[PDB]
Write a structure and sequence with these properties.
The structure is cut from a larger assembly and holds chains A (53 residues) and B (52 residues). With 53 residues, chain A is mainly β. Chain A contains no helices and 2 strands. Chain A is elongated and about 55 Å long. Chain B contains 1 helix and no strands. Chain B has one helix at residues 34-37. The chains are: A mainly beta (53), B little secondary structure (52).
């Protein structure tokens, strides 16, 4: 297929486009705040190998 | 919980056999398998002692 569409950004609030994504990071203490989202490591309770996600 | 882990490997010194002018297959295990080292390593000689 072929799709056309728009992305425009006037400034401050006047942001327009189809599908805004608009990620939510507030509340997370981030290593590199431009990352979006965050990593956690647990390590198993029986096996002691790492588990990351 | 807790525990401790180690990784190592052991092996046979080239020419330990002493009995040959050449290796088999040219790529050999360095591990102490029966065929590779049981009773064969020239660096060591064992004697049992009786009568003490």
């Amino acid at each position: 297929y072929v799709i056309v569409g728009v992305v425009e950004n006037i400034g401050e609030k006047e942001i327009v486009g189809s599908i805004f994504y608009a990620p939510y990071t507030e509340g997370l203490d981030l290593d590199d705040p431009e990352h979006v989202g965050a990593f956690k490591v647990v390590v198993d309770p029986e096996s002691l190998q790492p588990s990351i996600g | 919980v807790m525990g401790f882990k180690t990784r190592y490997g052991i092996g046979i010194n080239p020419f330990a056999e002493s009995a040959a002018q050449a290796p088999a297959s040219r790529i050999q295990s360095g591990m102490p398998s029966i065929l590779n080292s049981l009773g064969k390593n020239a660096y060591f000689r064992r004697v049992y002692v009786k009568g003490i």
